Design a protein around this ligand. Structure first.
Ligand SMILES: *C1O[C@H](CO)[C@@H](O[C@@H]2O[C@H](CO)[C@@H](O)[C@H](O)[C@H]2NC(C)=O)[C@H](O)[C@H]1NC(C)=O
Ligand SMILES: *[C@@H]1O[C@H](CO)[C@@H](O[C@@H]2O[C@H](CO)[C@@H](O)[C@H](O)[C@H]2NC(C)=O)[C@H](O)[C@H]1NC(C)=O
Ligand SMILES: [Mg+2]
Lengths: 48, 192, 505, 144, 84, 48, 108, 47
């Protein structure tokens, strides 16, 4: 498991983020060239 | 359009100065105002709500005179006109207070109405004829008992003809509606 | 604002537009606004003179302030309720100027001599309209005459602005704010203009205008406005925590009765519990109040029949705690009324010659009586409505105490259940919630005439439905709760609290 | 059955220490499957339980933005398993879901640890791979 | 049925939060009436920001107006406790 | 940026002047209400 | 520590304030696990029941080792013998995202 | 209105513009930390 931490330092703004893990020939995951491994999350302000 | 302005001064003294305006119609660019001696009034308005005689639909117009903006409805007769400085006064006799008023009714004495002297070109009133009028609370002006009713864009005036002019076919239906509305407003009021 | 004083001499003028611009269901909402307002004013005990005027083209005066019936809140409510929208629909004008002159005629004295108390008398004017006056002159000039008549704002030495307040309500579907804003009185940090959406949540509207300067110490009066917290909803509610070594932490409830005194149950404490180990927080502050002494009832004994075979004995389970420093009453801190006091007479709107037995007849009839207590759910106080079984099912309410654990084979039912106990719980006539053990010590509250009266103190329950520290999931229906009747211990309370000046009969 | 029907799954975690004595305070690092949100009230029972606690800033947020969960256990038995359980529900409507993960460690030692995965089809949650001796290949695909 | 997809549940969650504060806006706009003119200035400026954000469904404004209207609500609650 | 306006005083005393402004695509606004003295024409004289 | 020493007869005990922030200077939200211990010469002795669990809020936390717990920790009931020795603190703080961990130490 | 701007009616103007204010008197009677009393005054600003 890898841990990618995304940080939001707006004082009054939560953000809609599309985050994506890219395809890797050296690492097997759900990310392939045809099908991407992407998610849509929401980060509250002054939080991670 | 808003007039422009030019002010002149020096860097060592701002207090002594001079300022002039400009407009493509007005010479000093100061727009239009009315004033009697020391007491002045705003006058960048239409002269009154003139209609182009096509709307003879009085039944719509008189029913719309029961809107809450109207603070007096009077039937008058003009007696004497006198020009002045930047205004002219119209001495009228009030025949009946049809709606509201906000002052005493009195009825049967001289009541002075004043218009800007630049509004003679828009509509010339004629003496001895009857006229039907209405306005709002900003129209009557000054201090009691020298209150003055000033003619402005919100004031409405129409001639009520004499008995023989009503017998002409154009003023047939016109004298009907203005006569019915006189009865309609001293009996029924507004239903809003 | 509006000052509420018991020496109040106040004229309240009510003007309601009845033009076609209002609509009947907005007119009904306008009336329901006034009826709750008249009822909330009468809850304080102030007697104002009411004037009622409905106007269209012409005003119609229903109640004059000169009449002696103008001081009857019940009569004016009956006169207002009878008024229909279509009563004077056929005259559908909006002549606000004549209605103000009618109010001007009410305040106008005959000749040149005002009656004495003219500067004593407060005046309140309430208008509901669409803001679209179409008949008569300008309404503002009658207000200038009203300002000139009452000598308000016309002198620097004595401005007299605190004697007149004008509120305007925007009713009807369509409303003009510009006329309404000019009509209403304009004062710093005082709300005088209300819109169409303001007609809902009436308790918040009343909270802005009312000033309780001379009415701070009134018992059993609640602010039910939506922004109000648990302690706006219950000013008397006191949270009592006993933290002592070996015994551990234990929490009980209480009710404010005086500046120095709080009433709660006695079994939450014992003689071994020390005063420094007891903390009370009333207004919700984390600053716990220090106490001086805890006054147990002299006839209380938990081990009275312990040698006979009864484990715990809950007769006379009441106690009074004395604070180290007295409370200062406020919007979240107020006492609860006690029966057979002069405050209870003014709360129930009784004559002052009403006896202690007549109040006992009204508060406790031999029937199912509506009541309520307070409980905690996730550190937040909430209300639980119950029924007091004083009717024919009172015996059946006592008989279900046979199922109390530890008392299954105790033969005599009258021994363990004294006449001090009032019985709630069960499913007849309706399902009554049962107390948690943290809910013990609280008051048993009865609502009458927009005020709240305490008739009991929470004691014990038959089945502990809250054993796993949660009142979750259903329980058997024969679980009853018992509460100590205040009428039984009235000589002890009157003996102790006559030094607090509560006005006992 | 009581008409609360939805797409529902329950996650159960158990552990035991192998040492000669009971291990002291340990921490549960749990990551949700993608688009899964736990039932809140089950964790309310766990947080207020004895020898167990959930931090407030993690606890009160909950619902859909809960993806990583932190649970503290005060002790674990060395003789038999200590366990807990809570519900999860999907809300995202996506195929090929990411498996979740649970990691165990102590506060004095992060290096000695253990991590297991889970997926509703694969036993160890490690998806599908092909390998010949030492040379392995990705295989989370259709067959052809 | 098919469960709601990605952003649709998240935007609905933000709208439900904004709808909850607007129900008591008329109570809070009233509640500043007996308070100082700063609160009455702040809430009517902050009120339209929340009112437009709900009907426009813009994510940026609905985020900002939620925390902005919460801030003045905390100031009113602290005002009403301190005013008594 | 300075925005000039032209007005005419109509009555003596300390009278009220009010202006407002609001921005598009953001909900930030400002209003300024001040009062200034309307003095009738004339000047101070301190004679003996 | 509030004071960089411990006075043996302090009834409150040694107070150790925790401050945690990101490397770029913003406040850390998390939960800290902290334990105390005693150092005698080059040899360190650990007190096991001195463990506490505090959340780190607003970039900060606070933990106190009381006088009773330290005297309960040592098997010597004399307060006189504690003079001349030294204390040490070991703390373990984890973010509420649970993705990173820092171990710090104050000693001597 | 429906346009992307604050409507004029709910624009609240700044009007409290005096130059000098906060003419207040207070006494330091708070608990002395090293002989120093720490007084907290929550005050309204002006416009
Ligand atoms: C006054 O009119 C009635 C009185 O109850 C209410 O009418 C609302 O407005 C329209 C009807 O014109 C309906 O679509 C709404 O459903 C009505 N009810 C509401 C909002 O609860 C209302 O209380 C008042 N206001 C208006 C604008 O009509
Ligand atoms: C009622 O009205 C009078 C107005 O005459 C008020 O003024 C008081 O008048 C009396 C006698 O003229 C004086 O003794 C008081 O000193 C006045 N009060 C002041 C100046 O504040 C007063 O409010 C009322 N008088 C009563 C109740 O006697
Ligand atoms: Mg009307």
């Amino acid at each position: 498991e890898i841990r990618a931490v995304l940080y939001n330092y707006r004082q009054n703004q939560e953000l809609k983020v599309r985050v994506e893990l890219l395809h890797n020939p050296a690492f097997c995951s759900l990310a392939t060239t045809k099908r991407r491994h992407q998610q849509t999350v929401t980060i509250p302000p002054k939080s991670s | 359009i808003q007039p422009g302005a030019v002010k002149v001064y020096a860097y060592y003294n701002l207090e002594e100065s001079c300022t002039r305006f400009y407009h493509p119609e007005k010479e000093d660019g100061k727009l239009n105002k009315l004033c009697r001696d020391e007491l002045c009034r705003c006058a960048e308005e239409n002269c009154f709500i003139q209609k182009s005689d096509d709307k003879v639909t009085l039944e719509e117009r008189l029913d719309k005179a029961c809107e809450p903006g109207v603070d007096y409805v009077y039937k008058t007769r003009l007696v004497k006109v006198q020009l002045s400085n930047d205004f002219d006064e119209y001495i009228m006799a009030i025949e009946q207070t049809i709606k509201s008023g906000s002052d005493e009714v009195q009825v049967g004495q001289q009541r002075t109405f004043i218009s800007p002297i630049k509004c003679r070109e828009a509509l010339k009133l004629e003496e001895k004829k009857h006229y039907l009028m209405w306005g709002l609370s900003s129209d009557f002006w000054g201090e009691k008992p020298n209150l003055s009713y000033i003619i402005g864009k919100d004031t409405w005036v129409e001639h009520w003809p004499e008995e023989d002019e009503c017998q002409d076919e154009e003023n047939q239906k016109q004298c009907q509606d203005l006569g019915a509305f006189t009865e309609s407003m001293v009996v029924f009021g507004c239903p809003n | 604002k509006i000052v509420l004083d018991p020496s109040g001499s106040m004229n309240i003028y009510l003007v309601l537009d009845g033009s076609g611009s209002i609509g009947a269901s907005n007119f009904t909402g306008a009336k329901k606004c006034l009826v709750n307002l008249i009822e909330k004013v009468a809850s304080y005990g102030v007697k104002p003179r009411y004037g009622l005027v409905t106007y269209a083209t012409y005003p119609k005066i229903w109640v004059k302030v000169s009449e002696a019936d103008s001081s009857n809140a019940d009569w004016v409510t009956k006169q207002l309720n009878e008024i229909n929208y279509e009563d004077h629909k056929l005259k559908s004008g909006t002549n606000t100027k004549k209605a103000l002159q009618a109010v001007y005629s009410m305040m106008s004295w005959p000749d040149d001599v005002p009656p004495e108390g003219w500067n004593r008398t407060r005046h309140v004017i309430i208008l509901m309209t669409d803001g679209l006056h179409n008949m008569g002159g300008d309404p503002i000039t009658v207000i200038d005459e009203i300002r000139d008549l009452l000598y308000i704002g016309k002198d620097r030495k004595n401005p007299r602005e605190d004697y007149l307040d004008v509120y305007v309500f925007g009713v009807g579907p369509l409303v003009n704010q510009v006329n309404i804003n000019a009509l209403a009185s304009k004062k710093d940090n005082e709300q005088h203009v209300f819109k169409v959406k303001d007609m809902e949540n009436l308790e918040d509207v009343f909270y802005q205008m009312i000033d309780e300067s001379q009415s701070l110490s009134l018992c059993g009066m609640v602010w039910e406005h939506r922004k109000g917290t648990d302690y706006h909803k219950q000013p008397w509610q006191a949270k009592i925590s006993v933290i002592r070594p070996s015994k551990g932490h234990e929490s009980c409830m209480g009710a404010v009765v005086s500046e120095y005194f709080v009433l709660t149950a006695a079994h939450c404490f014992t003689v071994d519990d020390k005063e420094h180990s007891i903390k009370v927080s009333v207004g919700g502050e984390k600053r716990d109040l220090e106490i001086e002494v805890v006054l147990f009832h002299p006839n209380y004994n938990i081990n009275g029949k312990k040698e006979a075979g009864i484990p715990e004995f809950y007769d006379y389970d009441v106690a009074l705690i004395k604070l180290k420093n007295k409370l200062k009453y406020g919007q979240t801190i107020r006492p609860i009324c006690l029966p057979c006091t002069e405050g209870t007479t003014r709360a129930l709107r009784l004559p002052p010659t009403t006896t202690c037995q007549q109040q006992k007849e009204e508060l406790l009839p031999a029937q199912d009586i509506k009541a309520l207590f307070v409980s905690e759910e996730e550190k937040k106080l909430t209300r639980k409505e119950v029924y007091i079984k004083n009717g024919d099912k009172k015996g059946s309410c006592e008989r279900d105490a046979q199922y109390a654990p530890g008392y299954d084979k105790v033969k005599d039912i009258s021994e363990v259940v004294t006449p001090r106990f009032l019985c709630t719980g069960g499913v007849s006539p309706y399902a009554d919630p049962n107390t948690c053990r943290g809910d013990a010590g609280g008051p048993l509250i009865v609502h009458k005439r927009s005020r709240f009266i305490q008739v009991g103190v929470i004691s014990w329950g038959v089945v502990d439905v809250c054993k796993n520290q949660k009142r979750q999931k259903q329980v058997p229906a024969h679980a009853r709760d018992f509460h100590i009747n205040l009428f039984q211990v009235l000589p002890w309370l009157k003996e102790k609290l006559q030094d607090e000046d509560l006005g006992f009969l | 059955r009581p008409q609360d029907a939805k797409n529902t799954m329950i996650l159960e975690i158990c552990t035991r220490y192998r040492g000669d004595q009971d291990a002291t305070m340990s921490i549960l690092d749990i990551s949700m499957m993608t688009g899964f949100a736990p039932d809140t009230d089950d964790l309310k029972q766990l947080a207020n339980g004895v020898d167990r606690y959930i931090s407030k800033y993690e606890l009160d947020k909950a619902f859909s933005d809960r993806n990583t969960l932190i649970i503290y256990l005060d002790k674990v038995s060395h003789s038999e398993d200590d366990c807990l359980a809570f519900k999860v529900h999907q809300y995202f409507n996506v195929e090929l879901i990411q498996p979740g993960a649970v990691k165990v460690y102590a506060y004095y030692n992060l290096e000695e640890s253990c991590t297991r995965f889970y997926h509703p089809e694969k036993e160890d949650g490690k998806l599908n791979k092909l390998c010949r001796d030492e040379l392995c290949r990705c295989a989370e695909e259709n067959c052809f | 049925t098919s469960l709601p997809t990605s952003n649709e549940y998240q935007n609905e969650k933000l709208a439900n939060e904004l709808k909850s504060l607007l129900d008591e806006l008329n109570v809070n706009e009233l509640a500043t009436g007996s308070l100082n003119t700063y609160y009455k200035r702040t809430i009517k400026i902050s009120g339209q920001k929340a009112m437009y954000a709900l009907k426009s469904k813009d994510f940026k404004k609905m985020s900002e107006a939620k925390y902005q209207l919460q801030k003045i609500y905390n100031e009113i609650d602290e005002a009403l406790k301190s005013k008594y | 940026l300075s925005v000039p306006y032209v007005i005419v005083p109509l009555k003596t005393g300390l009278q009220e002047v009010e202006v407002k402004a609001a921005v598009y695509h953001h909900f930030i606004s400002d209003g300024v209400r001040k009062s200034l003295k309307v003095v009738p024409e004339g000047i101070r004289m301190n004679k003996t | 520590p509030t004071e960089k020493f411990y006075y043996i007869y302090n009834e409150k005990g040694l107070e150790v304030t925790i401050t945690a922030r990101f490397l770029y200077g913003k406040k850390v939200e998390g939960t800290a696990f902290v334990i105390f211990g005693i150092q005698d010469g080059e040899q360190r002795i650990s007190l096991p029941e001195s463990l506490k669990r505090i959340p780190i809020e607003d970039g900060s936390g606070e933990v106190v080792l009381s006088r009773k717990v330290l005297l309960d920790g040592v098997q010597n009931p004399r307060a006189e013998d504690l003079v001349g020795k030294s204390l040490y603190v070991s703390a373990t703080v984890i973010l509420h995202s649970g993705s990173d961990m820092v171990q710090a130490e104050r000693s001597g | 209105l429906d346009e992307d701007i604050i409507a004029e009616e709910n624009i609240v103007s700044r009007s409290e513009f005096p130059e000098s204010w906060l003419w207040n008197v207070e006494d330091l009677k708070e608990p002395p930390k090293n002989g120093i009393s720490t007084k907290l005054m929550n005050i309204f600003l002006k416009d």
